[PDB]
Every structure is written in C-alpha cells, then in structure tokens.
Amino acid sequence: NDLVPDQWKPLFNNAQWLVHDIVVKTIYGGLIIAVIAHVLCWAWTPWIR
Amino acid sequence: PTLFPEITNTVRGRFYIVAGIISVVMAVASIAIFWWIFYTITPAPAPPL
Amino acid sequence: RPFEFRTSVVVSTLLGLVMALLIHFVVLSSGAFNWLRA
C-alpha cells in the first residue's frame, strides 16, 4: 500500500491502485472516443432535431 | 497488474478470454453472414400484379 | 476493508457493457438511424 496516496490508503491496496489507474485511463480514453463518436454521429444525422 | 490472476495469468484461464471472444465473434459472424447470403440471393417477393 | 476494487471493477464493467448494448439496441430499433440502412 506504499504506492497509494495516504488519502486513499484506507481504500486501495498496492495492486488495486495500479489496476484502478488502468481503469481510470481506460475510462478517460473511452470517454474521449465516445465524445468524438457522438460529434460525428451528430454531424451525420442529428437525433434531437 | 491484475485482480484475476487465475483468469489473466494462468494459461488455462488466460485462454478462456480468447475462447469467449472467438466464440462470440464466431456466432455473430455465423448469423450475420447467413442473413447476408439469404437476403442477397433471395429474389424480392414478386411485385403484386 | 469495504468495497473490494475487484467488485467495483466487475460491477462497473458489466454495467457499462449492458448499457452500451441497451443503448445500441434502442438506437438501432428506433429507425431514426434506420439500423444503418439509410
């Protein structure tokens, strides 16, 4: 639990922190891709009209 | 950095991910390619007289 | 220690997959996008 910031030490193990970092970065990348996909689908066919 | 070492480290468990993925895409390709063939070779129902 | 990180990961990933499938199916069946037929 040394790698975890002491704020989140009660919650995150040493290994759980690295997997949490991977999950966070994956969620952020997926969010960017989702925003791009939504902008493209809107420029193509607006669903709200 | 993993939480499922029996699923992502061990060769038998690691293999199960690829097995599931390949089976899902195999079933989807099965259904999709069948319906593609059926709809491309089948003639349109004859126009009503 | 409450809330195992593994549990949150499983729940979030399954919720995201289920929601992606549900939203795709709702959008495809709506025919606003016409199952991509256009």
Binding site: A37, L40 | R14, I21 | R37
Partner: peptide
Amino acid sequence: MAPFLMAFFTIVLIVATLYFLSMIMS
C-alpha cells in the same frame, strides 16, 4: 456516412481488443 461509421466502430472495437488483450496477454 453509415458505412464509414460502422467500419469506424468495428475498427475501434478491434483496436481496443488488441490493446487490452495485449495487457492481459503480458
């Protein structure tokens, strides 16, 4: 633009799969 988008989303699916399976298969 629908064929463009379907191809786009399938390749994003595939590349996502190569990335995280690469990690799992590390």
